[PDB]
Amino acid sequence: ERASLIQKAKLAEQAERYEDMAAFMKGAVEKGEELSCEERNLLSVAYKNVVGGQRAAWRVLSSIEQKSNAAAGPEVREYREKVETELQGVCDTVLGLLDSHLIKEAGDAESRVFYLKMKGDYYRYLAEVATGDDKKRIIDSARSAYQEAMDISKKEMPPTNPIRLGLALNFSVFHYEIANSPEEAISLAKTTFDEAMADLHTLSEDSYKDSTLIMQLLRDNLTLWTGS
């Protein structure tokens, strides 16, 4: 079974059917076994694409909604609410999968950081759309996951680790966008980049490629945020 679900998730990926892929990956997670590094990425890619499209759509609708006055009816609000609810449901699913099965007492720091990054990420997606008082608690639920992941990555991983790098990138994005702390964001991105730069010399062909990729995303963000 599980094998078949993973096989079908790989097949759904090839067919660019990420809604289906996420469904298969959810079913594979629900089998209770640990996802292999390959299998984690399948789950992440699937949901990343699903939410990716929803967020993209929601941004389009919200921009139309905010540029009120140049027309705006109940259809913009109503339909933006439809997409919002739908997107929120997916995040709630991923987060459910993460608490119920993926985030475990102790594994390897890589899987450990991956799933907490993931938890931070999906709470950040919820924050992106959050408007109420829930905004505070959602923002905090994301801060906590990202910080818990940070703690693991800073102990167990080198500053060149792509998982450590990726996490710091997303947490800085969280500090800038969500938390509205550009100072904290710029610093995190700066430190992260500067520290990985100080260790680039050690890395192998394979390692270097993955690490410098994220380092460029950090640098691009820093350029954008500092205005240079």
């Binding site: 990138l169 997303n170 994005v173 800038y176 966008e177 954008l224 945020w225």
Partner: peptide
């Protein structure tokens, strides 16, 4: 100045 990377 385009959308932030994540």
């Amino acid at each position: 100045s385009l959308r932030r990377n994540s």
